[PDB]
Write a protein that binds this ligand. Structure first.
Ligand SMILES: Cc1cc2cc(c1)C(=O)N[C@@H](c1ccccc1)C/C=C/COC[C@@H]([C@H](O)CNCc1cccc(C(C)C)c1)NC2=O
Length: 373
């Protein structure tokens, strides 16, 4: 696993990617790591934002599946043609597998100018693959075709980080690993049982936190919350930070807030705790996130007399999304073999006053199931 450490790169706010090769002879591409979807897809024709792309006609091992595919995400969409080819991860396990690949031929608001990645690795389950669940996802192929154990973990550092395939690297975290069940195998779906802001409970029925599912998604930046939960959370964050007033556009994630370089007032912003269902009845643990995680710096030389930030919590109409802002400075273990997700504090986490945490146990008397439907 040391060979896999620091195998992820990224531009701030533009996506974490791993190097892969596709085809025979190997064509090198940088591929976005996405636990929020299940299609492996690569740019396969010119695009103003791509420095390189998959050339199927140079690969003797390419097999055309004679089927088109269209994938509309929350942000962005693409379409292209299915086939299969040999794939390897130079800084992953030492194996070469034959995998499904979508050759993207048209796209809209999907590739990002300057992001350095040319494709996406959907690491979730076949139930949400397009065009349907018969298209085996990459990680499934890898496990079936090799001896790699059925689990991977991600340490995203807010850029670089590590994707450890087939295991857990103890150098990447401290303290204990706490596990929450994967509720259903489609997305990495989990259940939040409680939310607090500065230790104050939001006080809603816990099904609202999971309306109509809650997922762990490395392919989305923000923590995204159902409308009712989002409005409650903003109200409580505004209340805690009320010594300064910000425009509504800031709270809507449409406008930056800036402070003279070095003077960001971290202390006025609250910590947010998300309590995740535990492995034992009515037990939970919490992960705590600091404003350094949910106020995302926007690098722009033009504004660089200041430190400028966007509010990285937003409203969702498709359930909770624990995006990269939540994953950053946790080590997150996708323990597919045991149908659970592990969290620990990451070696790449804080202030001289507060530190992000993963801790438990917490018990609740309330017998409600927090799962939505
Ligand atoms: C609002 C928003 C949504 C999404 C991405 C971003 C922003 C974004 O800004 N992402 C960038 C990034 C930067 C820094 C860190 C992490 C990500 C770069 C990543 C692009 C890849 O997009 C991946 C996609 C992810 O699969 C979504 N999962 C739920 C889902 C919803 C609908 C359909 C489907 C499947 C089943 C087809 C899944 N993310 C976004 O939609």
């Amino acid at each position: 696993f040391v060979e896999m450490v620091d195998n992820l790169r990224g531009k701030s706010g533009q996506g974490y990617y791993v190097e892969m090769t596709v085809g025979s002879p190997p064509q090198t591409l940088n591929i976005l790591v996405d636990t929020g979807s299940s299609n492996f897809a690569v740019g396969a024709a010119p695009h103003p934002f791509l420095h390189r792309y998959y050339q199927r006609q140079l690969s003797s091992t390419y097999r055309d599946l004679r089927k088109g595919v269209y994938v509309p995400y929350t942000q962005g969409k693409w379409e292209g043609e299915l086939g299969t080819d040999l794939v390897s991860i130079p800084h992953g396990p030492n194996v070469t597998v034959r995998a499904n690949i979508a050759a993207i031929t048209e796209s809209d608001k999907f590739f990002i100018n300057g992001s350095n990645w040319e494709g996406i690795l959907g690491l979730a389950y076949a139930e949400i693959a397009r065009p349907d669940d018969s298209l085996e996802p990459f990680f499934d192929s890898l496990v079936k075709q090799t001896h790699v154990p059925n689990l991977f973990s991600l340490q995203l550092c807010g850029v670089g980080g590590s994707m450890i395939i087939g295991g857990i690297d103890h150098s990447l975290y401290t303290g204990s690993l706490w596990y929450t069940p994967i509720r259903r195998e489609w997305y990495y779906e989990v259940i939040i049982v409680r939310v607090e802001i500065n230790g104050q409970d939001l006080k809603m029925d816990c099904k609202e936190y999971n309306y109509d599912k809650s997922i762990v998604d490395s392919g989305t930046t923000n923590l995204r919350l159902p409308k009712k939960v989002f409005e409650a959370a903003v109200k409580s964050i505004k209340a805690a930070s009320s010594t300064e007033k910000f425009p509504d556009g800031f709270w809507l994630g449409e406008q930056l807030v800036c402070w003279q370089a070095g003077t960001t007032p971290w202390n006025i912003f609250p910590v947010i705790s998300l309590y995740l269902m535990g492995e034992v009845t009515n037990q939970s643990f919490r992960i705590t996130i600091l404003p350094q995680q949910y106020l995302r710096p926007v690098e722009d030389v033009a504004t660089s007399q200041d430190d400028c930030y966007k509010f990285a919590i937003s409203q969702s109409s498709t359930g909770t999304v624990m995006g990269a802002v939540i994953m950053e400075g946790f080590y997150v273990v996708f323990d597919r073999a045991r149908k659970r997700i592990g969290f620990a504090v990451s070696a790449c986490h804080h202030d001289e006053f507060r530190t992000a945490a993963v801790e438990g146990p917490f018990v609740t008397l309330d017998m409600e199931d927090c799962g939505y439907n």
